[PDB]
JSON list of C-alpha atoms in Angstrom, two decimals:
[
{"chain": "E", "resi": 1, "resn": "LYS", "atom": "CA", "xyz": [-6.18, 70.09, 10.48]},
{"chain": "E", "resi": 2, "resn": "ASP", "atom": "CA", "xyz": [-2.39, 69.60, 10.11]},
{"chain": "E", "resi": 3, "resn": "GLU", "atom": "CA", "xyz": [-2.77, 65.73, 10.84]},
{"chain": "E", "resi": 4, "resn": "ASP", "atom": "CA", "xyz": [-2.63, 63.08, 7.99]},
{"chain": "E", "resi": 5, "resn": "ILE", "atom": "CA", "xyz": [-5.28, 60.34, 7.68]},
{"chain": "E", "resi": 6, "resn": "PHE", "atom": "CA", "xyz": [-5.19, 57.18, 6.17]},
{"chain": "E", "resi": 7, "resn": "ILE", "atom": "CA", "xyz": [-8.79, 56.17, 4.16]},
{"chain": "E", "resi": 8, "resn": "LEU", "atom": "CA", "xyz": [-9.67, 53.23, 1.84]},
{"chain": "E", "resi": 9, "resn": "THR", "atom": "CA", "xyz": [-11.92, 52.39, -0.49]},
{"chain": "E", "resi": 10, "resn": "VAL", "atom": "CA", "xyz": [-13.05, 48.31, 0.15]},
{"chain": "E", "resi": 11, "resn": "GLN", "atom": "CA", "xyz": [-16.01, 47.05, -2.13]},
{"chain": "E", "resi": 12, "resn": "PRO", "atom": "CA", "xyz": [-17.02, 43.85, -0.81]},
{"chain": "E", "resi": 13, "resn": "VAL", "atom": "CA", "xyz": [-17.76, 39.90, -2.59]},
{"chain": "E", "resi": 14, "resn": "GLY", "atom": "CA", "xyz": [-19.48, 38.20, 0.12]},
{"chain": "E", "resi": 15, "resn": "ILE", "atom": "CA", "xyz": [-20.50, 36.85, 3.81]},
{"chain": "E", "resi": 16, "resn": "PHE", "atom": "CA", "xyz": [-19.18, 34.15, 5.61]},
{"chain": "E", "resi": 17, "resn": "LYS", "atom": "CA", "xyz": [-20.78, 32.58, 8.69]},
{"chain": "E", "resi": 18, "resn": "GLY", "atom": "CA", "xyz": [-18.78, 29.82, 10.99]},
{"chain": "E", "resi": 19, "resn": "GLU", "atom": "CA", "xyz": [-16.80, 28.09, 9.03]},
{"chain": "E", "resi": 20, "resn": "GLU", "atom": "CA", "xyz": [-17.54, 28.27, 5.33]},
{"chain": "E", "resi": 21, "resn": "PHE", "atom": "CA", "xyz": [-18.50, 30.77, 1.86]},
{"chain": "E", "resi": 22, "resn": "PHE", "atom": "CA", "xyz": [-20.96, 31.87, 0.26]},
{"chain": "E", "resi": 23, "resn": "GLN", "atom": "CA", "xyz": [-21.82, 34.12, -2.54]},
{"chain": "E", "resi": 24, "resn": "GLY", "atom": "CA", "xyz": [-23.39, 37.39, -1.65]},
{"chain": "E", "resi": 25, "resn": "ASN", "atom": "CA", "xyz": [-24.33, 39.18, 1.51]},
{"chain": "E", "resi": 26, "resn": "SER", "atom": "CA", "xyz": [-27.32, 40.97, 1.11]},
{"chain": "E", "resi": 27, "resn": "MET", "atom": "CA", "xyz": [-26.12, 43.35, 3.97]},
{"chain": "E", "resi": 28, "resn": "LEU", "atom": "CA", "xyz": [-24.34, 45.73, 4.06]},
{"chain": "E", "resi": 29, "resn": "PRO", "atom": "CA", "xyz": [-22.29, 47.13, 7.79]},
{"chain": "E", "resi": 30, "resn": "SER", "atom": "CA", "xyz": [-22.73, 50.34, 9.15]},
{"chain": "E", "resi": 31, "resn": "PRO", "atom": "CA", "xyz": [-20.49, 53.51, 10.83]},
{"chain": "E", "resi": 32, "resn": "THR", "atom": "CA", "xyz": [-18.43, 52.79, 13.50]},
{"chain": "E", "resi": 33, "resn": "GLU", "atom": "CA", "xyz": [-17.74, 49.08, 13.17]},
{"chain": "E", "resi": 34, "resn": "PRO", "atom": "CA", "xyz": [-14.00, 47.27, 13.08]},
{"chain": "E", "resi": 35, "resn": "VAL", "atom": "CA", "xyz": [-11.75, 46.09, 10.77]},
{"chain": "E", "resi": 36, "resn": "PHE", "atom": "CA", "xyz": [-9.70, 42.85, 11.52]},
{"chain": "E", "resi": 37, "resn": "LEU", "atom": "CA", "xyz": [-7.59, 41.83, 8.07]},
{"chain": "E", "resi": 38, "resn": "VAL", "atom": "CA", "xyz": [-7.64, 38.25, 6.88]},
{"chain": "E", "resi": 39, "resn": "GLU", "atom": "CA", "xyz": [-5.52, 35.37, 7.40]},
{"chain": "E", "resi": 40, "resn": "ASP", "atom": "CA", "xyz": [-3.45, 33.14, 4.49]},
{"chain": "E", "resi": 41, "resn": "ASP", "atom": "CA", "xyz": [-5.37, 29.84, 6.49]},
{"chain": "E", "resi": 42, "resn": "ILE", "atom": "CA", "xyz": [-8.71, 30.45, 5.65]},
{"chain": "E", "resi": 43, "resn": "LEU", "atom": "CA", "xyz": [-8.30, 31.42, 2.09]},
{"chain": "E", "resi": 44, "resn": "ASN", "atom": "CA", "xyz": [-7.10, 28.24, 1.17]},
{"chain": "E", "resi": 45, "resn": "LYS", "atom": "CA", "xyz": [-9.88, 26.71, 2.60]},
{"chain": "E", "resi": 46, "resn": "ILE", "atom": "CA", "xyz": [-12.00, 28.29, 0.90]},
{"chain": "E", "resi": 47, "resn": "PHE", "atom": "CA", "xyz": [-10.09, 28.05, -2.53]},
{"chain": "E", "resi": 48, "resn": "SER", "atom": "CA", "xyz": [-9.82, 23.84, -1.13]},
{"chain": "E", "resi": 49, "resn": "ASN", "atom": "CA", "xyz": [-13.21, 21.84, -1.95]},
{"chain": "E", "resi": 50, "resn": "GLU", "atom": "CA", "xyz": [-13.27, 19.05, 0.25]},
{"chain": "E", "resi": 51, "resn": "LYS", "atom": "CA", "xyz": [-13.62, 16.12, -1.30]},
{"chain": "E", "resi": 52, "resn": "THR", "atom": "CA", "xyz": [-16.15, 17.13, -4.29]},
{"chain": "E", "resi": 53, "resn": "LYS", "atom": "CA", "xyz": [-13.76, 15.48, -6.95]},
{"chain": "E", "resi": 54, "resn": "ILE", "atom": "CA", "xyz": [-11.25, 18.84, -6.44]},
{"chain": "E", "resi": 55, "resn": "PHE", "atom": "CA", "xyz": [-9.77, 19.80, -10.31]},
{"chain": "E", "resi": 56, "resn": "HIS", "atom": "CA", "xyz": [-6.22, 21.41, -9.78]},
{"chain": "E", "resi": 57, "resn": "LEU", "atom": "CA", "xyz": [-5.62, 25.12, -11.56]},
{"chain": "E", "resi": 58, "resn": "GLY", "atom": "CA", "xyz": [-3.10, 26.50, -10.53]},
{"chain": "N", "resi": 1, "resn": "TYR", "atom": "CA", "xyz": [-61.76, 31.09, -20.41]},
{"chain": "N", "resi": 2, "resn": "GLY", "atom": "CA", "xyz": [-59.45, 30.70, -17.48]},
{"chain": "N", "resi": 3, "resn": "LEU", "atom": "CA", "xyz": [-56.39, 29.62, -18.24]},
{"chain": "N", "resi": 4, "resn": "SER", "atom": "CA", "xyz": [-52.77, 31.40, -17.04]},
{"chain": "N", "resi": 5, "resn": "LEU", "atom": "CA", "xyz": [-49.59, 31.37, -17.96]},
{"chain": "N", "resi": 6, "resn": "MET", "atom": "CA", "xyz": [-46.31, 31.20, -15.74]},
{"chain": "N", "resi": 7, "resn": "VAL", "atom": "CA", "xyz": [-42.95, 32.07, -17.75]},
{"chain": "N", "resi": 8, "resn": "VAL", "atom": "CA", "xyz": [-40.08, 30.82, -16.22]},
{"chain": "N", "resi": 9, "resn": "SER", "atom": "CA", "xyz": [-36.51, 31.49, -18.02]},
{"chain": "N", "resi": 10, "resn": "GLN", "atom": "CA", "xyz": [-33.04, 32.68, -17.06]},
{"chain": "N", "resi": 11, "resn": "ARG", "atom": "CA", "xyz": [-31.99, 34.56, -20.06]},
{"chain": "N", "resi": 12, "resn": "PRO", "atom": "CA", "xyz": [-34.68, 37.23, -20.60]},
{"chain": "N", "resi": 13, "resn": "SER", "atom": "CA", "xyz": [-32.92, 39.03, -22.96]},
{"chain": "N", "resi": 14, "resn": "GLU", "atom": "CA", "xyz": [-33.71, 35.83, -26.06]},
{"chain": "N", "resi": 15, "resn": "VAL", "atom": "CA", "xyz": [-37.90, 35.33, -25.41]},
{"chain": "N", "resi": 16, "resn": "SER", "atom": "CA", "xyz": [-40.28, 37.59, -27.48]},
{"chain": "N", "resi": 17, "resn": "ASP", "atom": "CA", "xyz": [-40.88, 40.38, -25.51]},
{"chain": "N", "resi": 18, "resn": "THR", "atom": "CA", "xyz": [-45.07, 39.70, -27.00]},
{"chain": "N", "resi": 19, "resn": "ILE", "atom": "CA", "xyz": [-45.54, 37.43, -24.71]},
{"chain": "N", "resi": 20, "resn": "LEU", "atom": "CA", "xyz": [-43.20, 39.06, -21.69]},
{"chain": "N", "resi": 21, "resn": "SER", "atom": "CA", "xyz": [-44.76, 42.43, -21.50]},
{"chain": "N", "resi": 22, "resn": "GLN", "atom": "CA", "xyz": [-48.89, 40.63, -20.89]},
{"chain": "N", "resi": 23, "resn": "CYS", "atom": "CA", "xyz": [-46.67, 40.00, -17.65]},
{"chain": "N", "resi": 24, "resn": "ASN", "atom": "CA", "xyz": [-48.12, 42.01, -14.14]},
{"chain": "N", "resi": 25, "resn": "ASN", "atom": "CA", "xyz": [-46.17, 39.82, -11.59]},
{"chain": "N", "resi": 26, "resn": "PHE", "atom": "CA", "xyz": [-42.42, 39.77, -11.46]},
{"chain": "N", "resi": 27, "resn": "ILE", "atom": "CA", "xyz": [-39.88, 37.33, -9.38]},
{"chain": "N", "resi": 28, "resn": "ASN", "atom": "CA", "xyz": [-36.41, 38.36, -9.99]},
{"chain": "N", "resi": 29, "resn": "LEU", "atom": "CA", "xyz": [-33.30, 36.42, -8.43]},
{"chain": "N", "resi": 30, "resn": "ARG", "atom": "CA", "xyz": [-29.59, 36.66, -9.08]},
{"chain": "N", "resi": 31, "resn": "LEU", "atom": "CA", "xyz": [-28.76, 37.93, -12.69]},
{"chain": "N", "resi": 32, "resn": "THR", "atom": "CA", "xyz": [-24.61, 38.72, -13.59]},
{"chain": "N", "resi": 33, "resn": "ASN", "atom": "CA", "xyz": [-25.71, 39.81, -16.85]},
{"chain": "N", "resi": 34, "resn": "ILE", "atom": "CA", "xyz": [-26.09, 43.55, -18.33]},
{"chain": "N", "resi": 35, "resn": "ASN", "atom": "CA", "xyz": [-28.75, 42.99, -21.18]},
{"chain": "N", "resi": 36, "resn": "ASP", "atom": "CA", "xyz": [-31.08, 41.22, -19.10]},
{"chain": "N", "resi": 37, "resn": "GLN", "atom": "CA", "xyz": [-30.69, 44.00, -16.27]},
{"chain": "N", "resi": 38, "resn": "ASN", "atom": "CA", "xyz": [-31.70, 46.61, -18.75]},
{"chain": "N", "resi": 39, "resn": "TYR", "atom": "CA", "xyz": [-33.88, 44.41, -20.37]},
{"chain": "N", "resi": 40, "resn": "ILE", "atom": "CA", "xyz": [-35.51, 43.81, -16.64]},
{"chain": "N", "resi": 41, "resn": "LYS", "atom": "CA", "xyz": [-35.12, 47.59, -15.29]},
{"chain": "N", "resi": 42, "resn": "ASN", "atom": "CA", "xyz": [-36.97, 48.32, -18.98]},
{"chain": "N", "resi": 43, "resn": "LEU", "atom": "CA", "xyz": [-39.57, 45.84, -18.21]},
{"chain": "N", "resi": 44, "resn": "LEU", "atom": "CA", "xyz": [-40.25, 47.33, -14.24]},
{"chain": "N", "resi": 45, "resn": "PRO", "atom": "CA", "xyz": [-41.04, 50.43, -12.46]},
{"chain": "N", "resi": 46, "resn": "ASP", "atom": "CA", "xyz": [-38.76, 52.92, -11.44]},
{"chain": "N", "resi": 47, "resn": "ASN", "atom": "CA", "xyz": [-39.09, 52.81, -8.01]},
{"chain": "N", "resi": 48, "resn": "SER", "atom": "CA", "xyz": [-37.96, 48.79, -8.52]},
{"chain": "N", "resi": 49, "resn": "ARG", "atom": "CA", "xyz": [-35.16, 50.14, -10.59]},
{"chain": "N", "resi": 50, "resn": "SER", "atom": "CA", "xyz": [-34.18, 52.34, -8.00]},
{"chain": "N", "resi": 51, "resn": "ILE", "atom": "CA", "xyz": [-33.23, 49.40, -5.54]},
{"chain": "N", "resi": 52, "resn": "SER", "atom": "CA", "xyz": [-31.94, 46.62, -8.68]},
{"chain": "N", "resi": 53, "resn": "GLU", "atom": "CA", "xyz": [-29.03, 47.74, -7.97]},
{"chain": "N", "resi": 54, "resn": "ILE", "atom": "CA", "xyz": [-29.41, 44.53, -5.41]},
{"chain": "N", "resi": 55, "resn": "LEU", "atom": "CA", "xyz": [-30.05, 42.08, -8.56]},
{"chain": "N", "resi": 56, "resn": "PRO", "atom": "CA", "xyz": [-26.10, 40.61, -8.91]},
{"chain": "N", "resi": 57, "resn": "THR", "atom": "CA", "xyz": [-25.73, 40.92, -4.97]},
{"chain": "N", "resi": 58, "resn": "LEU", "atom": "CA", "xyz": [-28.75, 39.11, -4.02]},
{"chain": "N", "resi": 59, "resn": "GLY", "atom": "CA", "xyz": [-27.87, 35.80, -2.28]},
{"chain": "N", "resi": 60, "resn": "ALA", "atom": "CA", "xyz": [-29.79, 32.49, -2.23]},
{"chain": "N", "resi": 61, "resn": "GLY", "atom": "CA", "xyz": [-32.70, 31.90, -1.75]},
{"chain": "N", "resi": 62, "resn": "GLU", "atom": "CA", "xyz": [-33.66, 35.62, -1.51]},
{"chain": "N", "resi": 63, "resn": "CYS", "atom": "CA", "xyz": [-35.79, 37.06, -4.48]},
{"chain": "N", "resi": 64, "resn": "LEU", "atom": "CA", "xyz": [-37.03, 40.72, -5.59]},
{"chain": "N", "resi": 65, "resn": "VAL", "atom": "CA", "xyz": [-40.69, 40.26, -5.46]},
{"chain": "N", "resi": 66, "resn": "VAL", "atom": "CA", "xyz": [-42.57, 43.16, -7.86]},
{"chain": "N", "resi": 67, "resn": "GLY", "atom": "CA", "xyz": [-45.90, 43.56, -9.23]},
{"chain": "N", "resi": 68, "resn": "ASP", "atom": "CA", "xyz": [-49.39, 44.86, -8.11]},
{"chain": "N", "resi": 69, "resn": "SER", "atom": "CA", "xyz": [-49.96, 41.91, -5.48]},
{"chain": "N", "resi": 70, "resn": "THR", "atom": "CA", "xyz": [-47.97, 43.32, -3.24]},
{"chain": "N", "resi": 71, "resn": "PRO", "atom": "CA", "xyz": [-47.95, 47.18, -1.54]},
{"chain": "N", "resi": 72, "resn": "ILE", "atom": "CA", "xyz": [-44.41, 47.39, -1.90]},
{"chain": "N", "resi": 73, "resn": "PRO", "atom": "CA", "xyz": [-41.82, 45.75, -4.35]},
{"chain": "N", "resi": 74, "resn": "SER", "atom": "CA", "xyz": [-39.77, 43.87, -1.64]},
{"chain": "N", "resi": 75, "resn": "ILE", "atom": "CA", "xyz": [-37.18, 41.23, -0.91]},
{"chain": "N", "resi": 76, "resn": "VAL", "atom": "CA", "xyz": [-38.51, 37.89, 0.25]},
{"chain": "N", "resi": 77, "resn": "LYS", "atom": "CA", "xyz": [-36.05, 34.84, 1.42]},
{"chain": "N", "resi": 78, "resn": "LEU", "atom": "CA", "xyz": [-38.09, 31.42, 0.82]},
{"chain": "N", "resi": 79, "resn": "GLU", "atom": "CA", "xyz": [-37.73, 27.92, 2.76]},
{"chain": "N", "resi": 80, "resn": "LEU", "atom": "CA", "xyz": [-36.75, 24.62, 0.37]},
{"chain": "N", "resi": 81, "resn": "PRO", "atom": "CA", "xyz": [-39.17, 22.74, -0.26]},
{"chain": "N", "resi": 82, "resn": "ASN", "atom": "CA", "xyz": [-39.74, 18.64, 0.79]},
{"chain": "N", "resi": 83, "resn": "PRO", "atom": "CA", "xyz": [-39.80, 16.65, -1.21]},
{"chain": "N", "resi": 84, "resn": "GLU", "atom": "CA", "xyz": [-36.85, 18.54, -3.48]},
{"chain": "N", "resi": 85, "resn": "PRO", "atom": "CA", "xyz": [-36.38, 18.34, -7.14]},
{"chain": "N", "resi": 86, "resn": "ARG", "atom": "CA", "xyz": [-33.29, 16.37, -8.69]},
{"chain": "N", "resi": 87, "resn": "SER", "atom": "CA", "xyz": [-31.53, 15.71, -11.94]},
{"chain": "N", "resi": 88, "resn": "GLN", "atom": "CA", "xyz": [-30.11, 12.17, -13.78]},
{"chain": "N", "resi": 89, "resn": "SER", "atom": "CA", "xyz": [-26.64, 13.07, -14.75]},
{"chain": "N", "resi": 90, "resn": "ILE", "atom": "CA", "xyz": [-23.52, 10.98, -15.33]},
{"chain": "N", "resi": 91, "resn": "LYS", "atom": "CA", "xyz": [-20.85, 12.21, -12.78]},
{"chain": "N", "resi": 92, "resn": "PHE", "atom": "CA", "xyz": [-17.79, 12.83, -16.04]},
{"chain": "N", "resi": 93, "resn": "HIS", "atom": "CA", "xyz": [-15.32, 13.17, -13.09]},
{"chain": "N", "resi": 94, "resn": "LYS", "atom": "CA", "xyz": [-17.05, 10.14, -10.47]},
{"chain": "N", "resi": 95, "resn": "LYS", "atom": "CA", "xyz": [-16.66, 7.69, -13.46]},
{"chain": "N", "resi": 96, "resn": "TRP", "atom": "CA", "xyz": [-13.62, 8.93, -15.18]},
{"chain": "N", "resi": 97, "resn": "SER", "atom": "CA", "xyz": [-12.12, 7.26, -11.92]},
{"chain": "N", "resi": 98, "resn": "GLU", "atom": "CA", "xyz": [-12.78, 3.97, -11.51]},
{"chain": "N", "resi": 99, "resn": "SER", "atom": "CA", "xyz": [-11.58, 0.73, -13.60]},
{"chain": "N", "resi": 100, "resn": "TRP", "atom": "CA", "xyz": [-11.36, 0.45, -17.17]},
{"chain": "N", "resi": 101, "resn": "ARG", "atom": "CA", "xyz": [-14.79, -1.55, -17.73]},
{"chain": "N", "resi": 102, "resn": "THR", "atom": "CA", "xyz": [-15.12, -3.35, -21.38]},
{"chain": "N", "resi": 103, "resn": "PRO", "atom": "CA", "xyz": [-18.38, -2.66, -23.36]},
{"chain": "N", "resi": 104, "resn": "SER", "atom": "CA", "xyz": [-20.47, -5.82, -24.55]},
{"chain": "N", "resi": 105, "resn": "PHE", "atom": "CA", "xyz": [-20.12, -4.71, -28.46]},
{"chain": "N", "resi": 106, "resn": "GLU", "atom": "CA", "xyz": [-22.08, -8.08, -29.76]},
{"chain": "N", "resi": 107, "resn": "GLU", "atom": "CA", "xyz": [-25.53, -7.02, -27.99]},
{"chain": "N", "resi": 108, "resn": "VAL", "atom": "CA", "xyz": [-25.16, -3.08, -28.82]},
{"chain": "N", "resi": 109, "resn": "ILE", "atom": "CA", "xyz": [-24.12, -3.91, -32.55]},
{"chain": "N", "resi": 110, "resn": "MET", "atom": "CA", "xyz": [-27.79, -5.42, -32.65]},
{"chain": "N", "resi": 111, "resn": "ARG", "atom": "CA", "xyz": [-30.50, -3.29, -32.01]},
{"chain": "N", "resi": 112, "resn": "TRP", "atom": "CA", "xyz": [-29.94, -1.63, -35.66]},
{"chain": "N", "resi": 113, "resn": "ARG", "atom": "CA", "xyz": [-31.40, -4.07, -37.28]},
{"chain": "N", "resi": 114, "resn": "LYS", "atom": "CA", "xyz": [-34.72, -5.02, -34.84]},
{"chain": "N", "resi": 115, "resn": "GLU", "atom": "CA", "xyz": [-35.83, -7.83, -36.92]},
{"chain": "N", "resi": 116, "resn": "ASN", "atom": "CA", "xyz": [-34.19, -7.56, -40.79]},
{"chain": "N", "resi": 117, "resn": "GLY", "atom": "CA", "xyz": [-33.56, -3.16, -40.68]}
]
């Protein structure tokens, strides 16, 4: 209709609740449901374990 | 004669097909290997194969139940037992963070010969 629309394809990796990450979702979002990007701090929290004898790889 | 078997395994593709063919009830947890998924699909009914695509995405505490005892194959979430099973490892990394320890070799070089050999 003489209008440009940008469309994306995504595949889920897990579900997190609160301030911790768990593998697997078993639930899927429905249409008309927002997306909110992501921040760099949460990736650091996920990939850096709390104690548990962390071993740095790279 | 009144005898039953519960077979627990994590590599279904390496167990004998003679014994796994007598199984009527299947409890499936998360699987990430293609061969195991294919073998399970071949063993499971077609309707369960249609919903089997959720095996790689199953979370913690959720299992797929298939068999005659259930009216519909389903996904069930279970609860943790009390008390809980636990193993006994030695925690290589935790022990490697301590100070240097010297074992007593005089005692351990014995018991190789209990009395005279």
